[PDB]
């Protein structure tokens, strides 16, 4: 029937608890979505080739040649956080719980309306939104994931973070193959190092199409469209953040002689000569002892060439690392590599009353400290006679190369298999949720862009179109762009994620840190006097946990 | 870039108080310690006192038990109550921020630097 | 506890000029000088960190050294504009407390 309804708008966010301290989050989140009919109804092939801009010595890493495959679909992503919690219930979760899991998936579209536009071209400028009862909404859900997976959240695509706003889908695309050259250069190189783009290799060739591949479902003004009830099978997150780094590993050392009175001057003291102290070291030509030297169990950490640049078949990318600097918290301009950046807009945080295509930008500086500081390391000869001469140290002060601003520590790495390191933490509201395992024979560790990472397969994309509204001048003969009726649809989007997740416990004699709200930070959960809104990003390991 | 100002310097009796302040804009005021530094006319400097984030505080001998060093983070603003001024006291006083975060009773107050502020002048006589 | 300094130094434009400034190990032995300049009636400057590295802007006529209980300052390619008093600045480590020294005035010739 034309004239009922087919769903219900819920964006309610529950608790319900259970023994053992557990708690089923159920966060459902409703939407009113925007679709526009395709630019056209044709999958091109395109082509990206910034040449004028990387032509300039020394800017290859703004390479952004590609090729792509544009289709006339478009993608309904919630695989972000704000689409799903609002800043109270998330203080909730992070301040209240210690662990979460990812347990279901459902989205439904539900009250699809479309409407046909005609403008009347009078003198004065008017138009008329006229309904289309028999137009349909294409919807083809790829349950099998057999299209290639574009989580949005990396571009800041998703649907929207406020309810009471509507929210668009985004045009679908898909990565072709291009083989593609560009030799690193320097302000300061002769001519132009080859800036080539080879084309595509007939081995490396997928044209994927929806219609080919996905049911479709042909929803009227009066139908809906259930996608059915998907179960996760990721590894727990953790809302806590360790600070044990290698030198707090352990047992200290016992102090022979102790402070008598408060003062900051007034240290206390090992007690013993260095070369008379008892322990274990893995320096075996030294019997020097010292925190610095001391065994420990493990690495907790590593250091990677941070900015190496890589170049394979596609062109040069940075070499993504777990983690960023240790002690950046305490300063913006050291958030150096590793800890991301997000830029975003209205519909995902910005000061919606703002002017302009600047997007708003944060630095997650993070709580844990599995990171390096590479000004303090520094590599000495083996002999390890102290102190050490300029010639048995290499210092990150040194020349790599002979160039002064390129120090050892850029080429190097110390992973092994000794390295413990954690992963990433949620970032609300701009962090993904979950992403599709590689399908390599060997899988890497950790996903540095979503915390649930998925083992076996997880939730089919939803992709939306306006069917041809053919007006009757129609010939498939014809070599111009097809006469289409201009028509548009918005339908609603209910979803459902339910999370499982424990409840943290006091385990030491001091508070711990928990989210806020401040004179400071009020006015960042308010709408403004016109009615602007906004979402800052919020930390999610706030609580220290025991590493050893 | 950072920038400091102060106030509070004036001529007073001897004995009795004078309550100085300093404020600050550009830096995290929270993570770096706060300190006064004083200069006679035409004579040479010397520390007054430093106050590490916790409001642990530090002061020379010349002043130690006179004077109270304070903050408050939430304005940026630091304060240095002076009871029990003497004429020897009269000197320009700078307000200072040193280099490196620091925080709790074992950070040292000053180590090298600061970019000190424009000072205010302080006078004792009767 | 106080550094000792030098109380006056002359030089004549564009040669070099020297400024020593002598502590103990508990205060330059430990933690390095860092010299300041005070033009007339200013708030004084930074010139020199005890790191060896110099702030932003500072010329690069200034440089320091550091051997044993003492320190000292140069300058390379002395000009008008240098002419200012000039301080050395250490951390006695026993007292806890910031010691200045007594203060240098150089003559630009």
């Known amino acids: 029937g034309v004239g009922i309804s087919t769903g219900t708008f819920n964006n309610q966010t529950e608790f319900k608890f259970l023994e053992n301290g557990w708690v089923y989050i159920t966060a459902n989140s409703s939407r009113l979505v925007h679709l526009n009919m395709p630019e056209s109804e044709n999958y091109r092939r395109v082509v990206v080739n910034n040449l004028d801009k990387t032509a300039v010595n020394g800017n290859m890493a703004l390479d952004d040649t590609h090729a792509e495959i544009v289709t006339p679909w478009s993608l309904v992503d919630a695989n972000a956080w704000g689409v799903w919690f609002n800043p109270g219930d998330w203080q909730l979760i992070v301040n209240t719980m210690s662990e979460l899991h990812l347990v279901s998936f459902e989205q439904e579209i539900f009250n699809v309306v479309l409407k046909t536009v005609s403008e009347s071209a009078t003198q004065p400028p008017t138009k008329v939104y006229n309904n289309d009862l028999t137009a349909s909404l294409m919807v083809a859900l790829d349950s099998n994931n057999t299209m290639p997976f574009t989580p949005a959240a990396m571009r800041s695509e998703t649907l929207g973070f406020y309810p009471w706003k509507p929210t668009i889908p985004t045009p679908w695309r898909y990565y072709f193959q291009w083989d593609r050259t560009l030799i690193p250069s320097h302000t300061g190189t002769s001519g132009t190092p080859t800036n080539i783009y080879h084309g595509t290799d007939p081995d490396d060739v997928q044209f994927y199409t929806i219609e080919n591949s996905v049911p479709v479902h042909l929803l009227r003004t009066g139908d809906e469209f259930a996608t059915g009830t998907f179960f996760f099978d990721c590894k727990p997150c953790r809302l806590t953040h360790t600070w044990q780094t290698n030198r707090a590993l352990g047992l200290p050392p016992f102090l022979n002689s102790l402070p008598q009175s408060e003062g900051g001057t007034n240290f206390g003291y090992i007690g013993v000569q260095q070369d008379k102290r008892r322990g274990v070291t893995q320096m075996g030509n030294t019997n020097y002892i010292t925190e610095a030297t001391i065994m420990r169990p493990a690495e907790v950490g590593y250091s990677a060439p941070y900015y190496s640049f890589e170049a394979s078949t596609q062109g040069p990318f940075k070499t993504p690392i777990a983690a960023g600097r240790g002690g950046a918290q305490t300063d913006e301009n050291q958030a150096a590599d590793g800890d991301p950046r997000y830029a975003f807009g209205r519909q995902h945080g910005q000061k919606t009353t703002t002017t302009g295509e600047t997007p708003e930008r944060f630095t997650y500086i993070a709580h844990q400290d599995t990171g390096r500081y590479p000004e303090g390391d520094w590599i000495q000869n083996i002999n390890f006679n102290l102190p050490v001469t300029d010639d048995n140290v290499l210092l990150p002060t040194d020349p790599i190369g002979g160039k002064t601003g390129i120090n050892y520590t850029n080429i190097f790495n110390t992973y092994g298999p000794l390295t413990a390191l954690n992963n990433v933490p949620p970032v609300y509201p701009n962090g993904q949720i979950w992403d599709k395992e590689f399908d390599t024979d060997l899988k890497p560790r950790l996903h540095v862009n979503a915390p649930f990472v998925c083992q076996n397969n997880c939730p089919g994309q939803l992709f939306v179109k306006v069917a041809p509204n053919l007006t009757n001048q129609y010939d498939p003969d014809a070599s111009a762009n097809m006469s289409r009726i201009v028509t548009y649809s918005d339908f609603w989007w209910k979803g459902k994620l339910v999370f499982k997740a424990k409840l943290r416990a006091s385990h030491t004699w001091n508070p711990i840190q928990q989210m806020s709200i401040n004179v400071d930070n009020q006015f960042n959960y308010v709408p403004s006097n016109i009615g602007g809104m906004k979402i800052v990003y919020e930390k999610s390991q706030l609580a220290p946990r025991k590493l050893y | 870039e950072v920038q400091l100002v102060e106030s509070g310097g004036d001529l007073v009796k001897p004995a009795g108080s004078l309550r100085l302040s300093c404020v600050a804009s550009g830096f995290t005021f929270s993570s770096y310690g706060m300190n006064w530094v004083r200069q006679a006319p035409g004579k040479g400097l010397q520390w007054v006192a430093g106050?590490?984030?916790?409001?642990?505080?530090g002061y020379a001998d010349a002043v130690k038990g006179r004077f109270t060093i304070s903050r408050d983070n939430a304005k940026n603003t630091v304060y240095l109550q002076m009871n029990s001024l003497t004429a020897e006291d009269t000197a320009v006083y700078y307000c200072?921020?040193?280099?490196?975060?620091?925080?709790?009773?074992?950070?040292?107050?000053?180590?090298?630097?600061?970019?000190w502020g424009q000072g205010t002048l302080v006078t004792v006589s009767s | 506890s106080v550094l000792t300094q030098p109380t006056s130094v002359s030089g004549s434009l564009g040669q070099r000029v020297t400024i020593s400034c002598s502590g103990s190990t508990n205060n330059i032995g430990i933690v390095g000088a860092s010299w300041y300049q005070q033009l007339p009636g200013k708030a004084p400057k930074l010139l020199v960190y005890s790191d060896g590295n110099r702030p932003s802007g500072v010329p690069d006529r200034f440089s320091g050294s550091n051997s044993g209980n003492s320190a000292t300052l140069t300058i390379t390619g002395l000009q008008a504009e240098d002419e200012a008093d000039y301080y050395c600045?250490?951390?006695?480590?026993?007292?806890?407390?910031?010691?200045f020294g007594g203060g240098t005035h150089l003559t630009v010739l």
């Open positions: 106050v590490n984030s916790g409001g642990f505080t």
């Open positions: 200072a921020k040193d280099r490196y975060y620091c925080t709790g009773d074992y950070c040292f107050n000053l180590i090298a630097f600061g970019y």
């Open positions: 600045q250490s951390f006695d480590t026993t007292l806890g407390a910031a010691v």
